[model samples]
Target: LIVTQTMKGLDIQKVAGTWYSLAMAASDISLLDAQSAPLRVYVEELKPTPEGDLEILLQKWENDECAQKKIIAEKTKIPAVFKIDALNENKVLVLDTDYKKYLLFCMENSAEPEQSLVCQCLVRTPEVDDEALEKFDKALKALPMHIRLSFNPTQLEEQCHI
Candidate 1:
């Protein structure tokens, strides 16, 4: 993986915030509206690992119900300093010491925990756009037929926000 830091950065301070999951394939990247199942994404404090990299713990909650708690599928450690790789008006991507790239997709509106679709992606560093999409497509395709047929993120909207 190609890992490079191009800027001096700030400490990741506020992990407990809302973020939207943007569609990777299309130009019309719409902000997942609050009417969708609200996915409340949060980052716990960054801690130091024995190996010297700082670990950033993450978790998610839905509908204010504890049953839907999900931890980040991947483990990430913080670098000595932060370096943002990609930044535009809408999104920012950063790299940590362990060579893992963290992409923060910003939310358009701030709503309560009950209004969001909590989605996440885990991958190795420096993946090309095509490669990332291909991997995600395969995973989405592998979902059980029943889930694919009945997956209604909007249903969670009543209980949470998208």
Candidate 2:
């Protein structure tokens, strides 16, 4: 089914490597909010599954290899789009990305759609600049829910060592 509104030409390979959680504003207010950051996603170089579907690796809060995610780089009459398979998830979109230092995404469990949009931003640096904050600030307004949290370095777990 249709997931994302706009498609992006995300060079899955270039976006690979390590990405740091710069900041985020969640639709829901909970401690899981805590789990999402210091949340490093080690996007392994893109490869395909046995079925020839594209997939990548994601290391969550812990670096212990969390998920080998399925990604759809759908190019069609519409803008190039991106979506991460949620398994039983309602929806997850690579909402937007600059492919350099930041990505804005949202995971919405439509079953729990009231505030399921766990929208996030990513950075290559530990420090978040005003530009990053502004980006989230602007996007958050466009997304749903007024409740949100700013991303911070204190959010890291094993990353604290760095």
Candidate 3:
């Protein structure tokens, strides 16, 4: 919750696509086991409503399987910051992205810091930048998990585009 700024003005048009998981730091590790390796987020469609809101047909992979979640990404006045009501999360930050090289998305419970949903890092491709890695590592420090904080997915997943 220490992020004072976000990657605002993110071209929603370009941000609409598939993003693969790099490292995931979940609050409940056990519940998020399937959300780990090979995790894929297929952004089916991102359409702008007349209300100036965004409707997204988002999908996430569960291990070898996949599930789709239709959600209207909650947007603040700025870009890259969203809230998914269905997920009961208010702070979903994209942190940084170019819709090409990397896109770091994170989620945390402002009300319950101990919940442990620190971040789920994502990148456009397998490669990662030093700055993004450092930023993601630092973001995990906000939560006090007894075990190691950051992670690197040993098994990389494939990004499925619709």
Candidate 4:
């Protein structure tokens, strides 16, 4: 039997923003670096649909200089329909079909993809306090064996905070 869960009064407008890639497990992080390979970022654009569920239009950054290849065309265009599972004062978790999930980080920015900062992208929620670090590490341990990398906020120098 298929069971559908409904999230009442959950707003998508509060969760849209440009997120930076903090860490990636199975996926390649280099995809996000403009200087490296083709720089791509994930975007969540809201569009009205006939169904009550929210439709997310996902897009990736493509290099316009490449005339021979069209990376943007290869990217997925169909917006995934999903329902907000839960929401707190700061964050919201969205669940699409097949149980795939995404955690939206809160940011004080516009929904326009160009205006959003990449610092918001994270493989998972980061630990802001020492107490949370322990929990974060424990969660990390539950995952498969993989290389993990951390970034220092000081490395950004002047462009650290936004």
Best by TM-score: 3
lDDT score, candidate 3, position 70: 79
Per-residue lDDT of candidate 2, residues 23-138 (tens digit): 55555565234444432243333443334333544445444434444355432233333344444444545666676776666556656654556655666566666786676567
TM-score of each: 0.25, 0.60, 0.61, 0.30
Query: Model 1: per-residue lDDT, tens digit, 20-124?
Result: 222222112232222222323333334444443334443444345523332322123432232221121211223221123333221211222112212233223
Model 2 accuracy (lDDT, Cα): 0.50
Q: Rate the local accuracy (lDDT) of all candidates.
A: 0.28, 0.50, 0.56, 0.28
Q: Which consecutive 10 residues in model 1 have the weakest lDDT in total?
A: 142-151
Model 3 segments more than 4 A misplaced: 1-5, 31-65, 87-89, 126-131, 142-155, 158-162
Each candidate: RMSD: 14.9, 5.4, 5.0, 12.9
Candidate 2: where is the Cα deviation over 4 Å? Answer: 1-5, 31-87, 154-162
Candidate 3 has an lDDT of 0.56
Q: Which pairs clash in model 4? A: 19-120, 19-121, 20-118, 20-120, 20-121
Clashes of each: 15, 5, 2, 5
Considering TM-score, where higher is better, how would the candidates rank from best to worst?
3, 2, 4, 1
How does residue 84 of candidate 3 score in lDDT? 67
Higher-ranked by TM-score: 2 or 3:
3
- Between candidates 1 and 2, the lDDT winner: 2
Model 3 lDDT per residue over 54-114, tens place: 6766566654556777768676776777776744566767666677656666555566545
